Symmetry: D2
Amino acid sequence: MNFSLEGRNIVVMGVANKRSIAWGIARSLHEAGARLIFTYAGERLEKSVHELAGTLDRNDSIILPCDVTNDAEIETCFASIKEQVGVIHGIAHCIAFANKEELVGEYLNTNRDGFLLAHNISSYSLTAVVKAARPMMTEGGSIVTLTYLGGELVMPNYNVMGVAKASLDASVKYLAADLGKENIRVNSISAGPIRTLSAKGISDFNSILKDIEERAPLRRTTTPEEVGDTAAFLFSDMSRGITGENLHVDSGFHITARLE
Amino acid sequence: MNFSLEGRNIVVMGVANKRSIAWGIARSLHEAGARLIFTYAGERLEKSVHELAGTLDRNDSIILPCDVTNDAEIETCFASIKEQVGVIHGIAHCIAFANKEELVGEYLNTNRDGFLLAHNISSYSLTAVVKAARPMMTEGGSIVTLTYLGGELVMPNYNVMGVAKASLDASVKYLAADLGKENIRVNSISAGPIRTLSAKGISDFNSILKDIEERAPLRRTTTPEEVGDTAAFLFSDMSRGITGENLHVDSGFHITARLE
Amino acid sequence: MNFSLEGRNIVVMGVANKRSIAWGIARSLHEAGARLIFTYAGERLEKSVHELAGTLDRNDSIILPCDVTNDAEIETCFASIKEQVGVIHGIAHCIAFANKEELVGEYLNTNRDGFLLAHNISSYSLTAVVKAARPMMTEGGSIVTLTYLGGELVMPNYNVMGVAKASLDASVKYLAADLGKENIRVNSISAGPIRTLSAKGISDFNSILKDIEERAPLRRTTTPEEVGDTAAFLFSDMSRGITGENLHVDSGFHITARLE
Amino acid sequence: MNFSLEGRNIVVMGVANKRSIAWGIARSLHEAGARLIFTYAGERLEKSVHELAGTLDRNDSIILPCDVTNDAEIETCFASIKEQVGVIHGIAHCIAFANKEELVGEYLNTNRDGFLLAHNISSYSLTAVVKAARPMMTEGGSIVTLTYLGGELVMPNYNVMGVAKASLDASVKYLAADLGKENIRVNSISAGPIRTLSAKGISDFNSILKDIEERAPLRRTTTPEEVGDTAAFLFSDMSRGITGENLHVDSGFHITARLE
Ligand SMILES: NC(=O)c1ccc[n+]([C@@H]2O[C@H](COP(=O)([O-])OP(=O)(O)OC[C@H]3O[C@@H](n4cnc5c(N)ncnc54)[C@H](O)[C@@H]3O)[C@@H](O)[C@H]2O)c1
Ligand SMILES: NC(=O)c1ccc[n+]([C@@H]2O[C@H](COP(=O)([O-])OP(=O)(O)OC[C@H]3O[C@@H](n4cnc5c(N)ncnc54)[C@H](O)[C@@H]3O)[C@@H](O)[C@H]2O)c1
Ligand SMILES: NC(=O)c1ccc[n+]([C@@H]2O[C@H](COP(=O)([O-])OP(=O)(O)OC[C@H]3O[C@@H](n4cnc5c(N)ncnc54)[C@H](O)[C@@H]3O)[C@@H](O)[C@H]2O)c1
Ligand SMILES: NC(=O)c1ccc[n+]([C@@H]2O[C@H](COP(=O)([O-])OP(=O)(O)OC[C@H]3O[C@@H](n4cnc5c(N)ncnc54)[C@H](O)[C@@H]3O)[C@@H](O)[C@H]2O)c1
Ligand SMILES: Cc1c(CN(C)C(=O)/C=C/c2cnc3c(c2)CCC(=O)N3)c2ccccc2n1C
Ligand SMILES: Cc1c(CN(C)C(=O)/C=C/c2cnc3c(c2)CCC(=O)N3)c2ccccc2n1C
Ligand SMILES: Cc1c(CN(C)C(=O)/C=C/c2cnc3c(c2)CCC(=O)N3)c2ccccc2n1C
Ligand SMILES: Cc1c(CN(C)C(=O)/C=C/c2cnc3c(c2)CCC(=O)N3)c2ccccc2n1C
């Protein structure tokens, strides 16, 4: 086996701009040879994502809308993919949302509507996309989602997104147990903090990143390319023994408890 | 400090019949001296629960309806409790629901509505009850919920309830981090399987229980009284250093991987 | 069942002075009614421990030497216990040692001799004491050891003691799986930091304790009495469904990743 | 970055025959371009390992004795490596031993000598080899050891090897925290069961493997090549954000609790 993704069609869900973790993943996968299908939420991202995809050195990308709020766009999107490419070999699920005011101060700033919205977008959407993709994954495949340490432990302010990530992380395991008999693997990458659009609203994020640079074993914060290169492994056949796993790409921060 | 719960008002949520784990908890807490407030869902359980409470040797129990589907009954119920007793010292949250057809065969038998219903009842309700109880917990307190190993690992058929338990387990941690500054602890008991009303629908449950008897370190399945006696510790001052914890009351089954 | 330890003979291993965690455990167990057998290492501790035991309100304690370096004293000690009391119902194992210069700076300051000494005293000794006690635990029983979060994650300077605690924690599980068929439970308490004789040599320990007071959910550092009161639960019949478990008595610190 | 190991000198410790997991790793690393240094224990393995290395398509391998019992051979071996190649970029540590009679029946079949031997060979040796290699790892590097699920949970008969693996797993974390500031990563692969020389003595191993084929998500047992291909990722720059991690290459078995 080898690391090449030539002849693999991979859906990358969640590019918003060039700082998106999904854009780090798309670059790594394209460099490995994959043909990419980008999905975006919101008509104003369409041109953005088309332009970023156009910087890739092959012009073979497909770009499609897919809001994951309910099933309707999911069905439209995956029908297009089925007609255009026939078979899907992977999905990178890079989607999260919660109401921003719930991600400041106490976790108890959430409420039922917000809690269920965060779980719908951040956790159920993986299952919804799996459901729509499964019958087109006829040649085996690999599904990767992104999680964060605040789904395992309390991270200040992460709040209802931590609870939704814990739901996502459990779903990765149950999906992996349903799909491995069809040679479909399901894993996550637990990325360290990265200054993306989804970092806007964190207080004193510069202090968080500085502390990671001091406390993490490798003495540096995570990049989208580190995350991308681990995702290229997970979509390749090199990782075929691995499913239901959560790989921390966080400079080792997960093994530490405090800064000396 | 001591194990007594004399002078503690504890709300026990989720008695349905004498096999309920919540009924094991209520017995242990009453024996330790607590005054109990029982809550029930559905008008047909009212007389049931009143009768079971009437078997306790003090006639000081309060029995109130509290469906946790939205906030409305929660607010009514906790207002009654505030007027009747003034201060709450504990809550035992023993509530779960998912659509039964999602808890057979593949996890992918769920759907958005079912997934969000399971999360609403089985996970958000703890937060909803916490929110309504917090201003009446003026003397410090202890909150205990019930979880199951299928929120940590794949258990056949547990499916969307495992994902909802993983959300519940994360919420226990974030609640504990919000409330410890008010001397309120939040913990779970991860009970081994018990033949309750919520076991109806498990296939070959007799085989599951027999396997636990063979594989568990202590060679026996869990009882509601084992769970109750651990919950009496968690509501007592003896456990005041413990919060955010998940105590397995499962005969040791959690430490095993297979039956020799 | 009840919390009483009347009629239970419990061996408490590792009192050195009144700050020892084992002394917090002995107090709680004596208050619950247990008859205690204290063991000490080193002839200079004999009078110390006799005097502390003499402050207990019943004068029924036995005090015996037991260095755990090899098996010889273990055998002498447990033979005395067998003749004096007949049956052992519990052991509190509160023993650790590593060379102090290995617990400063890098973990790589250890060496083979030091590593194996730390493992012998801090981890194998539990197995050695279990082996000598097992045939006198004819009425069921409960064994509790003390561990620390640095066996689960990196804690600065904890170094080879963290590795030895990880060995101890695994041994708790395998012991629990061997002994549950004889109604003997084996658990640990993972205590938060306490200023004991085994804290001498930690740098800036005042800063560590202050940070725990800020970061821990309950906003306070651990006491020996908190640890003692959880150990009284673990030796009582109230905890009979629990074995192979690690209970954190740390003010909730284990669920946090950083100080906001 | 890329997956190539051209220009990387990697020490592979623990080939015994063509079924060794280390031989799966060496093949994958050689295919990725690494120059390999094989180490073996026992003069009778010398010719074995030389012959297997001679099947590789470049004849650039070095083969050296390295018994890890004490430091002496380690020092000889690493001195040879330093003179022959100058810089080490990786180590694959594939070494374990315990007395076989301790790995049948109860864990309590161990004893002090056996316990400390298992820990010395199976856990401290990683630290000993790290210590000797560190000053030759001047260009950054990656260290991979092999662990097994029985270091996380009880696996029947794994016994003192499970305790020694738990010590190894903790050492991986503390090593990673010491060495990341020198751009050296330290990780493990937790392989599923493989019929190697170290499987001789397992009872009913055919039943264990059949059960894995039924219970594991991917419905198949692990191969040395699956393990090798994950180790090629860990030694490559693609995995540079990952340290202190334990990657399960076990067909997903780690996420399951029982066979339906
Ligand atoms: N930035 C971090 O520090 C970090 C660390 C670990 C994990 N993560 C996770 O990485 C993933 C990607 O986030 P990011 O940091 O790259 O930020 P981002 O804002 O670039 O990406 C989040 C994506 O989610 C999409 N999304 C939100 N609601 C959607 C909906 N209704 N339908 C479809 N798409 C929707 C957004 O359009 C956006 O493209 C998220 O799951 C996030 O939780 C982020
Ligand atoms: N039985 C087991 O094997 C087991 C093992 C571990 C944990 N648990 C958990 O224990 C808890 C109690 O379940 P049980 O096994 O005693 O069964 P049970 O059926 O007796 O109790 C479940 C309770 O949930 C209540 N509930 C359901 N929907 C509700 C709603 N909308 N509003 C308010 N209450 C609602 C029911 O009325 C019932 O009283 C649950 O959280 C369950 O997940 C059960
Ligand atoms: N102090 C903490 O912050 C803390 C936190 C968690 C766990 N622990 C653990 O609690 C336990 C008790 O330590 P402590 O903090 O009370 O300190 P302590 O120094 O009072 O107790 C340690 C005990 O170990 C005994 N011991 C050392 N070598 C021995 C040998 N060869 N034979 C027999 N006994 C031997 C000492 O005599 C002493 O009584 C230890 O396992 C320690 O790792 C301590
Ligand atoms: N086979 C499995 O099912 C399995 C599963 C997970 C992990 N592991 C681990 O994989 C590693 C490799 O074992 P394997 O299964 O390939 O079997 P193996 O017997 O082929 O390899 C074990 C190696 O350890 C070496 N070793 C033993 N004592 C030594 C000493 N004193 N000095 C130097 N080398 C010494 C042996 O010479 C042998 O080369 C071990 O750490 C084992 O625990 C094995
Ligand atoms: C690293 C990190 C993140 C980023 N992250 C891991 C996320 O999963 C972000 C999710 C997110 C989810 N929903 C959001 C936003 C961010 C901001 C914009 C918005 O409106 N809603 C984060 C987000 C909130 C609080 C703390 C946080 N930390 C410490
Ligand atoms: C022990 C166990 C349970 C019971 N349990 C732990 C639960 O949390 C049950 C939750 C539940 C949740 N919702 C349910 C029902 C049960 C049945 C009645 C119904 O209509 N909906 C369980 C439930 C489903 C599948 C497997 C299961 N196992 C192995
Ligand atoms: C809380 C804590 C402790 C204390 N502890 C948990 C221990 O297990 C101590 C073990 C110990 C073990 N061996 C030791 C000594 C202490 C000091 C005296 C000596 O000579 N050898 C500790 C010990 C060393 C480094 C950091 C530490 N932290 C953060
Ligand atoms: C998969 C597996 C293994 C193999 N393994 C993971 C190991 O780490 C083996 C270690 C080992 C360690 N020491 C050993 C031997 C094997 C056999 C030859 C000998 O003399 N001593 C194993 C080993 C013993 C018991 C159960 C076991 N299971 C279920």
